[PDB]
Amino acid sequence: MEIQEISKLAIEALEDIKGKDIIELDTSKLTSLFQRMIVATGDSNRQVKALANSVQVKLKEAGVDIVGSEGHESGEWVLVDAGDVVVHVMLPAVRDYYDIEALWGGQKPSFAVGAAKPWS
């Protein structure tokens, strides 16, 4: 389907498992790697991995092969690479720590809950 089509499919998928603070950034004029990026939050590895799974299962039944996933194990920061669009599902403390949204000119959602050991 169309670039912003697969995007809405990945977002809806993140919504099927109650994803928190879901956002979509247009990296179009920032890199050639991908056009649209999505960053959603999962309150627990369980939810994070479920959000990650939902995104893959949804894009597959729609005929959108996935380049591959990463970090689906620990469930702290899972990256579902879908070619021109990629989804980032990560724990609140993790999202805030790395703040990859800022990079692509995006503001990370309010946290203030605790992240003294983001590497732990």
Side-chain angles (χ1 to χ4, degrees):
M1 52 197 104
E2 287 306 76
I3 168 61
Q4 94 291 315
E5 285 292 3
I6 170 184
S7 173
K8 174 168 299 302
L9 207 295
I11 292 184
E12 182 180 65
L14 292 155
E15 299 196 8
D16 305 322
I17 321 300
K18 305 304 176 191
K20 269 180 163 173
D21 290 299
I22 303 177
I23 77 171
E24 198 192 310
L25 289 179
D26 191 6
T27 57
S28 54
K29 313 180 200 313
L30 293 304
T31 31
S32 46
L33 307 176
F34 36 80
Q35 276 59 275
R36 232 111 307 190
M37 171 173 281
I38 304 175
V39 176
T41 303
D43 300 311
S44 42
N45 319 64
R46 299 183 287 309
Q47 206 207 325
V48 177
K49 286 157 71 184
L51 291 161
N53 281 324
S54 188
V55 169
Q56 289 178 61
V57 183
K58 248 286 167 58
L59 297 177
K60 289 177 185 171
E61 305 193 311
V64 177
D65 328 311
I66 52 171
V67 178
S69 109
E70 190 187 316
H72 195 90
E73 42 256 18
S74 75
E76 314 186 305
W77 173 357
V78 181
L79 164 93
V80 169
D81 184 10
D84 320 87
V85 161
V86 56
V87 178
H88 281 81
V89 184
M90 41 190 136
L91 286 158
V94 179
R95 187 169 181 172
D96 147 63
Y97 187 52
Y98 295 99
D99 179 21
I100 72 176
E101 307 169 65
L103 215 176
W104 311 104
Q107 63 187 195
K108 36 82 198 71
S110 172
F111 182 34
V113 188
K117 301 286 295 304
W119 268 318
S120 181

Coordinates of all heavy atoms in Angstrom, one line a residue, residues 18-71:
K18 N -3.4 -1.3 23.6 CA -3.3 0.0 24.4 C -1.9 0.5 24.5 O -1.4 0.6 25.6 CB -3.9 -0.3 25.8 CG -5.4 -0.8 25.7 CD -6.3 0.1 25.0 CE -7.7 -0.4 24.8 NZ -8.4 0.4 23.8
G19 N -1.4 1.0 23.4 CA -0.1 1.6 23.4 C -0.1 3.0 23.9 O -1.1 3.8 23.6
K20 N 0.8 3.4 24.7 CA 0.9 4.7 25.3 C 1.7 5.7 24.5 O 2.8 5.4 24.0 CB 1.3 4.7 26.8 CG 0.2 4.5 27.8 CD 0.8 4.4 29.2 CE -0.3 4.7 30.2 NZ 0.1 4.5 31.6
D21 N 1.3 7.0 24.5 CA 2.0 8.1 23.9 C 2.6 7.7 22.5 O 3.8 7.9 22.2 CB 3.2 8.6 24.8 CG 2.7 9.3 26.0 OD1 2.1 10.3 25.8 OD2 3.0 8.8 27.1
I22 N 1.7 7.2 21.6 CA 2.1 6.8 20.3 C 2.3 8.1 19.4 O 1.4 9.0 19.3 CB 1.0 5.9 19.6 CG1 0.8 4.7 20.5 CG2 1.5 5.5 18.2 CD1 -0.3 3.8 20.0
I23 N 3.4 8.2 18.7 CA 3.7 9.3 17.9 C 4.3 8.9 16.5 O 4.9 7.9 16.4 CB 4.7 10.2 18.6 CG1 6.2 9.7 18.4 CG2 4.4 10.4 20.0 CD1 7.2 10.6 18.9
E24 N 4.1 9.8 15.5 CA 4.6 9.5 14.2 C 5.4 10.7 13.7 O 4.9 11.8 13.6 CB 3.4 9.3 13.3 CG 3.7 8.6 12.0 CD 2.6 8.7 10.9 OE1 1.4 8.3 11.3 OE2 2.8 9.1 9.8
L25 N 6.6 10.5 13.4 CA 7.5 11.5 12.8 C 7.9 11.3 11.4 O 8.0 10.2 10.9 CB 8.8 11.6 13.6 CG 8.7 12.1 15.1 CD1 10.1 12.1 15.7 CD2 8.2 13.5 15.1
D26 N 8.0 12.4 10.7 CA 8.3 12.4 9.2 C 9.8 12.6 9.0 O 10.2 13.7 8.8 CB 7.5 13.5 8.5 CG 7.5 13.4 7.0 OD1 8.1 12.4 6.5 OD2 7.0 14.4 6.4
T27 N 10.5 11.5 9.0 CA 11.9 11.6 8.8 C 12.3 11.8 7.3 O 13.5 11.8 7.0 CB 12.6 10.3 9.3 OG1 12.0 9.2 8.6 CG2 12.4 10.2 10.8
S28 N 11.3 11.9 6.5 CA 11.5 12.1 5.1 C 12.7 13.0 4.7 O 13.6 12.6 3.9 CB 10.2 12.7 4.5 OG 9.9 13.9 5.2
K29 N 12.8 14.2 5.2 CA 13.9 15.1 4.8 C 15.0 15.0 5.8 O 15.8 16.0 5.9 CB 13.3 16.5 4.8 CG 12.1 16.6 3.9 CD 11.5 18.0 3.8 CE 10.0 17.9 3.5 NZ 9.8 17.0 2.3
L30 N 15.1 13.9 6.6 CA 16.2 13.8 7.5 C 17.2 12.7 7.2 O 18.3 12.7 7.5 CB 15.7 13.7 8.9 CG 15.0 14.9 9.5 CD1 16.0 16.1 9.5 CD2 13.7 15.2 8.8
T31 N 16.6 11.7 6.5 CA 17.4 10.5 6.1 C 16.7 9.7 4.9 O 15.6 10.0 4.6 CB 17.6 9.5 7.2 OG1 16.5 9.5 8.1 CG2 18.9 9.7 7.9
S32 N 17.5 8.8 4.4 CA 17.0 8.0 3.3 C 16.6 6.7 3.8 O 15.9 5.9 3.1 CB 18.0 7.9 2.2 OG 19.3 7.6 2.8
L33 N 17.0 6.4 5.0 CA 16.7 5.1 5.6 C 15.2 4.8 5.6 O 14.8 3.6 5.3 CB 17.3 5.0 7.0 CG 18.7 5.4 7.1 CD1 19.1 5.5 8.6 CD2 19.6 4.5 6.4
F34 N 14.4 5.7 6.0 CA 13.0 5.6 6.1 C 12.2 6.9 6.1 O 12.8 8.0 6.4 CB 12.6 4.8 7.4 CG 13.5 5.2 8.6 CD1 13.3 6.4 9.3 CD2 14.6 4.4 8.9 CE1 14.1 6.7 10.3 CE2 15.4 4.7 10.0 CZ 15.2 5.9 10.7
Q35 N 11.0 6.9 5.7 CA 10.2 8.1 5.6 C 9.4 8.4 6.9 O 9.4 9.6 7.3 CB 9.2 8.0 4.4 CG 9.8 8.3 3.0 CD 10.9 7.5 2.6 OE1 12.1 7.8 3.0 NE2 10.7 6.4 1.9
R36 N 8.7 7.4 7.4 CA 8.0 7.6 8.6 C 8.4 6.7 9.8 O 8.8 5.6 9.6 CB 6.5 7.4 8.3 CG 5.6 8.5 8.8 CD 4.9 9.2 7.6 NE 5.9 9.7 6.6 CZ 5.6 10.6 5.6 NH1 4.3 11.0 5.5 NH2 6.5 11.0 4.7
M37 N 8.5 7.3 11.0 CA 8.9 6.6 12.2 C 7.8 6.7 13.2 O 7.1 7.7 13.3 CB 10.2 7.2 12.8 CG 10.5 6.7 14.1 SD 12.2 7.2 14.8 CE 13.4 6.0 13.8
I38 N 7.7 5.7 14.0 CA 6.7 5.7 15.1 C 7.3 5.2 16.4 O 8.1 4.3 16.5 CB 5.5 4.7 14.7 CG1 5.0 5.1 13.4 CG2 4.5 4.7 15.8 CD1 3.9 4.1 12.9
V39 N 6.9 5.9 17.5 CA 7.5 5.6 18.8 C 6.3 5.4 19.8 O 5.7 6.4 20.1 CB 8.4 6.7 19.3 CG1 8.9 6.3 20.7 CG2 9.6 6.8 18.4
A40 N 6.1 4.2 20.3 CA 5.0 4.0 21.2 C 5.6 3.5 22.5 O 6.6 2.9 22.5 CB 3.9 3.1 20.7
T41 N 4.9 3.7 23.6 CA 5.3 3.2 24.9 C 4.6 2.0 25.5 O 3.4 1.9 25.4 CB 5.2 4.4 26.0 OG1 6.0 5.5 25.5 CG2 5.8 3.9 27.3
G42 N 5.3 1.1 26.1 CA 4.7 0.0 26.7 C 5.1 0.0 28.2 O 6.3 0.1 28.6
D43 N 4.1 -0.1 29.1 CA 4.3 -0.1 30.5 C 5.1 -1.3 31.1 O 5.5 -1.3 32.3 CB 3.0 0.1 31.3 CG 2.3 1.4 30.9 OD1 3.0 2.4 31.0 OD2 1.1 1.3 30.7
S44 N 5.3 -2.4 30.3 CA 6.0 -3.5 30.8 C 6.5 -4.4 29.7 O 5.9 -4.4 28.6 CB 5.0 -4.4 31.7 OG 3.8 -4.4 31.1
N45 N 7.6 -5.1 29.9 CA 8.1 -5.9 28.8 C 7.0 -6.7 28.2 O 7.0 -6.9 26.9 CB 9.1 -6.9 29.4 CG 10.0 -6.3 30.4 OD1 9.5 -5.9 31.5 ND2 11.3 -6.2 30.1
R46 N 6.1 -7.2 29.0 CA 5.0 -8.0 28.4 C 4.2 -7.1 27.4 O 4.0 -7.5 26.3 CB 4.1 -8.4 29.6 CG 4.8 -9.3 30.5 CD 3.9 -9.8 31.7 NE 3.5 -8.8 32.7 CZ 4.3 -8.0 33.3 NH1 5.6 -8.0 33.1 NH2 3.9 -7.2 34.2
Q47 N 3.9 -5.9 27.8 CA 3.1 -5.0 26.9 C 4.0 -4.6 25.7 O 3.5 -4.5 24.6 CB 2.6 -3.8 27.6 CG 1.4 -3.2 27.0 CD 1.2 -1.7 27.2 OE1 1.6 -1.2 28.2 NE2 0.7 -1.0 26.2
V48 N 5.3 -4.3 26.0 CA 6.1 -3.9 25.0 C 6.3 -4.9 23.9 O 6.2 -4.6 22.7 CB 7.5 -3.6 25.5 CG1 8.5 -3.2 24.4 CG2 7.4 -2.5 26.5
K49 N 6.5 -6.2 24.3 CA 6.6 -7.3 23.4 C 5.3 -7.6 22.7 O 5.4 -8.0 21.5 CB 7.1 -8.5 24.1 CG 8.6 -8.4 24.6 CD 9.0 -9.3 25.7 CE 9.0 -10.8 25.4 NZ 9.2 -11.6 26.6
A50 N 4.2 -7.3 23.3 CA 2.9 -7.5 22.7 C 2.7 -6.5 21.7 O 2.1 -6.8 20.6 CB 1.8 -7.5 23.8
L51 N 3.0 -5.2 22.0 CA 2.9 -4.1 21.0 C 3.8 -4.5 19.8 O 3.4 -4.3 18.7 CB 3.3 -2.8 21.7 CG 2.4 -2.2 22.8 CD1 3.2 -1.2 23.6 CD2 1.2 -1.6 22.2
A52 N 5.0 -4.9 20.1 CA 5.9 -5.3 19.0 C 5.3 -6.4 18.2 O 5.4 -6.4 17.0 CB 7.3 -5.7 19.6
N53 N 4.8 -7.4 18.8 CA 4.2 -8.5 18.1 C 3.0 -8.1 17.3 O 2.9 -8.4 16.1 CB 3.8 -9.7 19.0 CG 5.0 -10.5 19.5 OD1 5.9 -10.8 18.7 ND2 4.9 -11.0 20.7
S54 N 2.1 -7.3 17.9 CA 0.9 -6.8 17.2 C 1.3 -6.1 15.9 O 0.7 -6.3 14.9 CB 0.1 -5.9 18.1 OG -1.1 -5.6 17.5
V55 N 2.4 -5.3 16.0 CA 2.8 -4.5 14.8 C 3.2 -5.5 13.7 O 3.0 -5.2 12.5 CB 3.9 -3.6 15.1 CG1 4.5 -3.0 13.8 CG2 3.4 -2.4 16.0
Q56 N 3.9 -6.5 14.1 CA 4.4 -7.4 13.0 C 3.3 -8.3 12.5 O 3.1 -8.4 11.2 CB 5.5 -8.4 13.6 CG 6.8 -7.7 13.8 CD 7.8 -8.7 14.4 OE1 8.1 -9.7 13.8 NE2 8.3 -8.5 15.6
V57 N 2.4 -8.8 13.3 CA 1.3 -9.7 12.8 C 0.3 -8.9 12.0 O -0.3 -9.5 11.1 CB 0.6 -10.3 14.0 CG1 -0.5 -11.2 13.5 CG2 1.5 -11.1 14.9
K58 N 0.2 -7.6 12.3 CA -0.7 -6.7 11.5 C -0.2 -6.4 10.2 O -0.9 -6.4 9.2 CB -1.0 -5.5 12.3 CG -2.4 -5.3 12.9 CD -3.4 -5.0 11.8 CE -4.8 -5.2 12.2 NZ -5.1 -4.3 13.4
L59 N 1.1 -6.0 10.1 CA 1.7 -5.7 8.8 C 1.9 -6.9 7.9 O 2.0 -6.8 6.7 CB 3.1 -5.0 9.0 CG 3.1 -3.7 9.8 CD1 4.5 -3.2 10.0 CD2 2.3 -2.7 9.0
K60 N 1.9 -8.1 8.5 CA 2.1 -9.3 7.7 C 0.8 -9.7 7.1 O 0.8 -10.1 5.9 CB 2.6 -10.5 8.6 CG 4.1 -10.3 9.0 CD 4.6 -11.5 9.9 CE 6.0 -11.2 10.4 NZ 6.5 -12.1 11.4
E61 N -0.3 -9.7 7.8 CA -1.6 -10.1 7.3 C -2.0 -9.1 6.2 O -3.0 -9.3 5.5 CB -2.7 -10.2 8.3 CG -2.3 -11.1 9.5 CD -3.5 -11.4 10.4 OE1 -4.3 -10.5 10.9 OE2 -3.7 -12.7 10.8
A62 N -1.3 -8.0 6.1 CA -1.7 -6.9 5.1 C -0.7 -7.0 3.9 O -0.7 -6.1 3.0 CB -1.6 -5.6 5.7
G63 N 0.2 -8.0 3.9 CA 1.1 -8.2 2.9 C 2.3 -7.2 2.9 O 2.5 -6.5 1.9
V64 N 2.9 -7.0 4.1 CA 3.9 -6.0 4.2 C 5.1 -6.7 5.0 O 5.2 -6.6 6.2 CB 3.5 -4.8 5.1 CG1 4.7 -3.9 5.3 CG2 2.4 -4.0 4.4
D65 N 5.9 -7.4 4.2 CA 7.0 -8.1 4.8 C 7.8 -7.1 5.7 O 7.9 -6.0 5.4 CB 7.9 -8.7 3.7 CG 7.1 -9.1 2.5 OD1 6.1 -9.8 2.7 OD2 7.5 -8.7 1.4
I66 N 8.4 -7.7 6.8 CA 9.2 -6.9 7.7 C 10.6 -7.2 7.6 O 11.0 -8.4 7.8 CB 8.7 -7.1 9.2 CG1 8.7 -8.6 9.5 CG2 7.4 -6.5 9.4 CD1 8.5 -9.0 10.9
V67 N 11.5 -6.2 7.4 CA 12.9 -6.4 7.3 C 13.5 -7.1 8.5 O 14.5 -7.8 8.4 CB 13.6 -5.0 7.2 CG1 15.1 -5.2 7.1 CG2 13.1 -4.2 6.0
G68 N 12.8 -7.0 9.6 CA 13.3 -7.7 10.8 C 13.1 -7.0 12.1 O 13.0 -5.7 12.1
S69 N 13.1 -7.7 13.2 CA 12.9 -7.0 14.5 C 14.3 -7.1 15.3 O 15.2 -7.8 14.9 CB 11.8 -7.7 15.3 OG 12.4 -8.4 16.4
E70 N 14.3 -6.4 16.4 CA 15.5 -6.4 17.2 C 15.1 -6.0 18.6 O 14.3 -5.1 18.8 CB 16.5 -5.4 16.7 CG 17.9 -5.5 17.3 CD 18.9 -4.4 16.8 OE1 18.9 -4.1 15.6 OE2 19.6 -3.8 17.7
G71 N 15.7 -6.7 19.6 CA 15.4 -6.4 21.0 C 14.1 -6.9 21.5 O 13.6 -6.5 22.5

